[PDB]
Amino acid sequence: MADKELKFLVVDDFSTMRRIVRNLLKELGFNNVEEAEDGVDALNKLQAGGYGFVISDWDMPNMDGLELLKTIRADGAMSALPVLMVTAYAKKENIIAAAQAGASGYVVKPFTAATLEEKLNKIFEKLGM
Ligand SMILES: [Mn+2]
Numbered sequence: 001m002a003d004k005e006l007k008f009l010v011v012d013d014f015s016t017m018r019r020i021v022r023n024l025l026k027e028l029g030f031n032n033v034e035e036a037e038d039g040v041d042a043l044n045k046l047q048a049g050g051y052g053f054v055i056s057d058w059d060m061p062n063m064d065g066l067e068l069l070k071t072i073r074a075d076g077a078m079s080a081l082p083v084l085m086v087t088a089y090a091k092k093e094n095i096i097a098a099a100q101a102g103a104s105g106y107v108v109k110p111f112t113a114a115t116l117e118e119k120l121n122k123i124f125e126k127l128g129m
Contacts, residue, residue, distance in 0.1 A: 001124040004029045006052040009045055011036045011068065012086070013060045017109070021055055021086075027113045028120075039063025043071060046078055053120075058087040058094065066101055073102040082123050 010021045010033055018035045025033055036042035038060045054072065058065040065085055072078050082104040087094065090108050098106055104123045
């Protein structure tokens with residue numbers, strides 16, 4: 001995947017968390033990044049079009065990560081959009097629920113740039129990108 005201009009949507013209800021992920025993406029060479037504060041805000045941005053990757057926190061108010069993921073997967077236009085779920089604590093049940101709903105990957109924060117880069121690269125490879 002050589003498109004460093006792949007457009008990311010970073011979804012988290014904590015501004016600091018969104019800024020962390022944006023800064024790690026910047027470090028890796030991904031500068032085309034937008035932010036959303038919950039699942040509905042995210043869906044509104046996604047319908048504007050152009051997005052290539054979603055990094056979403058699991059626990060958000062109003063519409064959480066799992067529901068956002070399900071909505072994306074049920075959307076004809078965005079059904080195959082890569083979605084990487086972020087959580088503070090890995091739980092078997094959550095990982096399985098996310099997988100059943102079509103998550104592309106799942107990562108525990110806090111994470112480093114190297115860790116994020118590995119998650120991304122493994123998803124690109126899994127998806128044939
Ligand atoms: Mn949260």
